Write a protein that binds this ligand. Structure first.
Ligand code: HEM
Ligand SMILES: [Co+2]
Ligand SMILES: [Mn+2]
Ligand code: NA
Length: 295
């Protein structure tokens, strides 16, 4: 059994590193300017989640979904219950897309995530251009993004569809250092940590070090809560119930640099799943932060 859907990366006509650095800079400047959003968390976390949700529809079996097509712009995916709240990220990106109308939707959504991680002091994420918009009938159906009310076996099985192994899964879930759950979006409420617009290994430290109590929230869903005001989803808590996940959680809690390196690889892989880069395509771009540019 096999399929023949191939998505070849095609560089936006005549564009090079300097063009994409300008898009990065525009995103980063707006992150700095529109910093009141979500009680001064800012838009960084929602842009990371947008990049992940637009990429995380991928199915390795038939190459449907994924970042290439930019299909979140279509109402079926836009209105996926799993994507509730991402509209805020999309709205943030609208004036960026207006200024740089040549960038594909896929490139913009993925670059938004890269920019957010880097501007929030995370590792450098190499990023490749060339995603090409595909039509409305290529939009994947709802239900390909993960449920939160599940255990480690669910998590492991879920992520096999994205060709992610245990280490890649645990690394990727470290992004929950950023932002928070919002009851109206997901039926869960609260942050995973304190410094939730700074990219760190705090998710792993909190998971291991806090005193967690299994509680019911105001939407009648179970979540783990600490006296510090943090929370963990059942899927997150499963990373310390499963012995193979627990070993990796401990590794990243004890070595931020290792987490950063593994996250960077896994996040680039996530954003590139399903894309064929031709042999003569440009090398991955590593963008400078605003702080690096003195901007
Ligand atoms: C089993 C896998 C996962 C589950 C079940 C899950 C679940 C959730 C849920 C329920 C929220 C709250 C949404 C809201 O109420 O606004 C959330 C937020 C978030 N997740 Fe995940 N997540 C998963 C994996 C990931 C991955 C792989 C990434 C990135 C690499 C990620 C990044 C984020 C970010 C950045 C937010 C914050 C959004 C904000 O503050 O606006 N998550 N996640
Ligand atoms: Co098939
Ligand atoms: Mn065939
Ligand atoms: Na400010």
């Amino acid at each position: 059994h096999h399929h023949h859907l191939v998505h070849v990366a095609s560089v936006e006509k005549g564009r090079s590193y300097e063009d994409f650095q300008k898009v990065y800079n525009a995103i980063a400047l707006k992150l700095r300017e529109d910093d009141e959003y979500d009680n001064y968390i800012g838009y960084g976390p929602v842009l990371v989640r947008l990049a992940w949700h637009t990429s995380g529809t991928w199915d390795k079996h038939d190459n449907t979904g994924g970042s290439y097509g930019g299909t979140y712009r279509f109402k079926k995916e836009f209105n996926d219950p799993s994507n509730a709240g991402l509209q805020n990220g999309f709205k943030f990106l609208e004036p960026i897309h207006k200024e740089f109308p040549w960038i594909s939707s896929g490139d913009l959504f993925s670059l938004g995530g890269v920019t957010a991680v880097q501007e929030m002091q995370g590792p450098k994420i190499p990023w490749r251009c060339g995603r090409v918009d595909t039509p409305e009938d290529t939009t994947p159906d709802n239900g390909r993004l993960p449920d939160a009310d599940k255990d480690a076996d669910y998590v492991r099985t879920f992520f096999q569809r994205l060709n992610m192994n245990d280490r890649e899964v645990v690394a990727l879930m470290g992004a929950h250092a950023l932002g928070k759950t919002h009851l109206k979006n997901s039926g869960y409420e609260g942050p995973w940590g304190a410094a939730n617009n700074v990219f760190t290994n705090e998710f792993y430290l909190n998971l291991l070090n806090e005193d967690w109590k299994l509680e019911k929230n105001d939407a009648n869903n179970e979540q783990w809560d600490s006296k510090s005001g943090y929370m963990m989803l059942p899927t997150d808590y499963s990373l310390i119930q499963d012995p193979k996940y627990l070993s990796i959680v401990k590794e990243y809690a004890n070595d931020q640099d290792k987490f950063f390196k593994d996250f960077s690889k896994a996040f680039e892989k996530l954003l590139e799943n399903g894309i064929t880069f031709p042999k003569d395509a440009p090398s991955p771009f590593i963008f400078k932060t605003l702080e690096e540019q003195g901007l």
